[PDB]
C-alpha cells in the first residue's frame, strides 16, 4: 500500500494516515491573551471564498475519470500547486490515449464524433464490408462522411489538428464545468454593459443633462440682450 | 519569435498563500481596532501595527514569489521576462501579482491604508487614489534627478 505508492509516484496522501496524529488540546480562549482569542462571531473578509482557477477545474475533471486521486472532494491549494508543475505530463497521457484510440477504431469511427449527420455504421468491420459490397475503399468513405459535416462541426474538429493538439479533456468539458474557471456568472449583470454596435445615442435619455441652450438665445430670453 | 512568449491574465500568478496571509493580517487589525476603541491600546500603537503588519505581509509575498515560479511554473512568461534579465525586476512584478503595499504622502509620512490588491486583481477606488501619490512623486523625483 503506502510506501509503495510513495516509491513509485502513484497517487497517495502526502502524510501516511497510520503515522498521523492529532494535535492534542490547545488554549481554549480562557488561557489565552486577548490578541490570540478567536472572535466570538465570524468576521466578513472579502477573502472568505477560494479563488477560482484553471487548475481546480482540470483536477476535478481528472479526478472523475480516475487519472488522479485527491485527498478530498475539492483540490487543496497544495494540490493545485503540484498540478501546475506536472500538468504537461497528464495532458500528454490524454493525447497519447487519443492517438491509440484512433489507431484502434480507424478514421471513420474516430472522426464521426464531429459528423452528427452520419448514421452509417463506422466500425472497421462495417467499413470493410461496405468496401466489398460497393467497391468504395476506406478513404472514399471517409471523404463521403466529411461531406456531411457542418462548418461549425469542422471548426470544433480542428482541436484534433496535429499542430494544434488541443487537450482532449478541454475539448469535451461541459459549460457548467468550464464556467467554474472564473467562478460562475458575475453578480453585476453584463446586460448593463451591453450596447448595440450600431446604436445611436439618445441625448434625451435619463442619464443626460438638459439640452444646452444657445448662448445668444438664452441671453435674449432672459432680457439681457436687445435685438 | 519562434517560441513566442506572451502575457495573459492567467500568467499573472499570485502565490497560493496570499489569501491566508491577507486574511490573517485583516483579523489582527480588526482585533486591535476593537481594543483601541475600548482604550486598551493607544493611537500610536494602532498606527505602528497597521504599517508594520502590512509591510511584513507584502515583503513576505515578494520573497516567496520567485520560489513559487521556480518550483511550480518555471516557464511562466512573466517570470521568464524578469528572471532572465530581459525586462523587468521583482518589484515591478510584485506590483502585478503580489500587492502594492504602503504608499507615502508628499510630506514624508505614510498613508494609514495599505493597498492589499495588485494590478491583476484591480485596485479599489480608495487604493487607486492612494497610488496616485506614488505616481505624482515618481515623476517629480526623476525630473529633479536628471536636473
Amino acid at each position: 500500500g503506502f510506501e509503495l505508492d510513495k516509491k513509485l509516484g502513484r497517487p497517495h496522501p502526502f502524510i501516511d494516515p497510520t503515522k498521523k496524529k492529532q494535535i492534542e488540546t490547545t488554549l481554549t480562549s480562557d488561557e489565552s491573551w486577548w490578541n490570540w482569542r478567536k472572535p466570538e462571531k465570524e468576521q466578513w473578509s472579502r477573502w472568505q471564498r477560494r479563488r477560482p482557477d484553471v487548475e481546480t477545474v482540470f483536477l476535478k475533471a481528472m479526478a472523475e475519470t480516475g487519472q488522479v486521486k485527491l485527498y478530498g472532494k475539492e483540490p487543496t491549494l497544495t494540490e493545485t500547486s503540484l498540478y501546475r508543475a506536472r500538468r504537461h505530463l497528464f495532458k500528454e497521457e490524454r493525447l497519447q490515449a487519443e492517438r491509440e484510440r484512433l489507431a484502434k477504431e480507424g478514421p471513420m469511427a474516430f472522426y464521426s464524433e464531429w459528423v452528427k449527420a452520419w448514421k452509417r455504421d463506422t466500425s472497421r468491420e462495417a467499413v470493410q464490408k461496405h468496401f466489398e459490397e460497393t467497391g468504395e475503399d476506406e478513404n472514399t468513405q471517409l471523404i463521403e462522411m466529411f461531406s456531411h459535416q457542418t462548418d461549425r462541426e469542422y471548426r470544433i474538429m480542428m482541436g484534433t489538428d496535429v499542430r494544434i493538439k488541443r487537450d482532449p479533456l478541454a475539448m469535451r468539458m461541459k459549460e457548467d464545468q468550464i464556467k467554474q474557471i472564473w467562478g460562475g456568472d458575475p453578480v453585476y449583470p453584463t446586460i448593463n454593459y451591453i450596447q448595440a454596435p450600431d446604436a445611436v445615442m439618445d441625448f434625451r435619455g435619463p442619464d443626460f443633462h438638459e439640452p444646452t441652450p444657445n448662448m445668444l438665445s438664452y441671453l435674449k430670453e432672459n432680457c439681457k440682450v436687445i435685438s | 519569435t519562434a517560441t513566442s512568449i506572451s502575457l495573459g491574465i492567467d500568467d499573472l500568478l499570485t502565490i497560493p498563500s496570499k489569501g491566508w496571509l491577507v486574511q490573517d493580517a485583516e483579523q489582527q487589525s480588526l482585533i486591535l481596532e476593537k481594543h483601541h476603541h475600548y482604550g486598551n491600546v493607544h493611537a500610536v500603537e494602532k498606527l505602528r501595527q497597521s504599517i508594520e503588519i502590512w509591510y511584513a505581509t507584502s515583503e513576505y509575498l515578494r520573497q516567496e514569489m520567485n520560489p513559487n515560479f521556480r518550483m511550480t511554473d518555471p516557464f511562466n512568461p512573466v517570470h521568464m521576462m524578469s528572471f532572465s534579465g530581459a525586462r523587468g525586476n521583482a518589484s515591478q512584478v510584485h506590483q502585478l501579482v503580489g500587492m502594492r503595499g504602503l504608499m507615502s504622502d508628499p510630506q514624508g509620512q505614510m498613508i494609514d491604508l495599505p493597498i492589499q490588491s495588485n494590478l491583476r486583481e484591480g485596485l479599489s477606488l480608495t487604493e487607486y487614489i492612494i497610488s496616485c501619490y506614488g505616481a505624482r512623486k515618481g515623476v517629480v523625483d526623476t525630473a529633479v534627478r536628471t536636473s
Binding site: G9, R10, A85, R86, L89 | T3, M80, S84, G85, A86
Partner: peptide, 29 residues
C-alpha cells in the same frame, strides 16, 4: 536575451519529466 534564455533552457527533469519514478536518440554528430 529572452530568445537565448528559451534556447538554452534545457530538458525538463525529474518529477517534471516523468509522471512515475523510473524505479533517447543518439546522434553521430
Amino acid at each position: 536575451l529572452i530568445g537565448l534564455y528559451v534556447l538554452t533552457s534545457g530538458t525538463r527533469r525529474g518529477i517534471c519529466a516523468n509522471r512515475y519514478n523510473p524505479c533517447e536518440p543518439f546522434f553521430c554528430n
